[PDB]
Amino acid sequence: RPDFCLEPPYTGPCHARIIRYFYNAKAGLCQTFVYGGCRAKRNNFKSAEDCLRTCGGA
């Protein structure tokens, strides 16, 4: 799987409170986190399904 899947979630500098998903390699599942709205990293998905399809098993 892509290495970006191993990066911690990144909220960014914008002040929004947008629910997004990131892959947590420690637990082996995609978890939710709050995204600020701008400058998202790659381990940031709009659905748990997209996240698992991209990072599952990393």
Partner: protein
Amino acid sequence: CGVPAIQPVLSIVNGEEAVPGSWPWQVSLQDKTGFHFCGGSLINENWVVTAAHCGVTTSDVVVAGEFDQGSSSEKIQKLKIAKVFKNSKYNSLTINNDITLLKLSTAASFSQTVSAVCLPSASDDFAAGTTCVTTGWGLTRYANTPDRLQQASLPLLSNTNCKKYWGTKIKDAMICAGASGVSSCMGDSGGPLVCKKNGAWTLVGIVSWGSSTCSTSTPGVYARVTALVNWVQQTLAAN
């Protein structure tokens, strides 16, 4: 516009609870489940101005007349969004031109707790040091959002002083305020930064970005409405 039926009491991290209904233009942008993700400002009965990075869609809703989001009994107006007008010049890389207009499906019913904020003229000059106010339900500590609407008085900063910290990240459609003991934070985005113009509260900025830890000694960055108001007027005129 810009005149609350209920006067606010002055004197968001380190801000204070607002008098219920004293910022009638403040709206809460929520998803279909009621989850607050951004703030916004009513500019008239059919339009709301917010930040482009909030990524609002027609599935989201505008909640007007709200004060305590933890009160299920509180009377509010859940307004559907007919169309979203994101400024085509919004730069997703630099965050410049961070503004979006929301056209409501059904007009909001203006009242004692629901009304519009005034818009400035493109040529208006709000001097640095001017004490303005920002409001919202964003975090009060950098955690869940406060139930009751918060407010904070803060000074506008000159571009020169802002750049002393942010350097070239400050663009032409951005205006800074804060670094004075308060700070906008997670959940405040899209909300208003207002200053008085002839006594009427006028939208000078839209909460955009800033310190990644909501530091109160760092300049907050807002979309400069004077640089974007012509785009606003044009959009309303064509829709």
